[PDB]
Amino acid sequence: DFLSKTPEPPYYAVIFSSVKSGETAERMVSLAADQPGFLGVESVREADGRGITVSYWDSMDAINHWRHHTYESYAVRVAKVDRQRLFQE
Amino acid sequence: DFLSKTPEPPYYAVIFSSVKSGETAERMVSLAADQPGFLGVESVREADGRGITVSYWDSMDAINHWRHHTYESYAVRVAKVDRQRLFQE
């Protein structure tokens, strides 16, 4: 349920780090989920407003057709994932 | 305070996504902070155990001397950040 079950690297990750000043954070998510090349999303938001949401994508090009069909502070970083290790017990 | 003030890409990011089963999550952090090439860290952990911690590093090599001097589920992904956009109001 929480961890995104991603394919073998490489794949991309969009790290959205935010500090809050809603219904619509969740529309913005159905939309990601719906896109071609969308691999999954991990979203977490603490009490005090601090939050990190990472979305995984299959290609730089898949991220552009998403930004295309489309906070006290935030940072958006897009990165190319070359390594992963998954664990559950 | 929350957002890491990172240099111009490229730089690396270590995305640690975890689901909890402590004092020592915080030792593991002083240590990151202390390393050569450590650029910063954003850590967030919700009530229910879900959590994302991303650490930023200047080089793949800076991450190896860290893993070197060194959960119901977790995922560790290392990625190369090629883009960033920072915002605050």
CA–CA separation, A74 and A19 (whole Å): 6
Experimental approach taken: X-ray
Residue written as tokens 């909890």? B20
B8 near A CB under 8 A:
no
SS3 content of chain B, % helix, strand, coil (to 5): 25, 45, 30
> Where would I find the beta strands (DSSP E) of chain B?
11-19, 38-45, 50-57, 73-88
How many C-beta atoms surround the C-beta of residue A81 within 10 A? 21
> How big is chain B by its Cα radius of gyration, in Å?
13
CA–CA separation, A19 and A9 (whole Å): 30
Chain A residues whose CB is inside 8 A of the B45 CB are 44, 46
How many C-beta atoms surround the C-beta of residue A85 within 10 A? 10
Q: What is the resolution in angstroms?
A: 2.3
B88 near A CB under 8 A:
yes
Residue B41 burial (C-beta neighbours within 10 Å; 0-12, 13-18, 19+): middle
For chain A, which domains are there?
A: 9-82 (3.30.70.100)
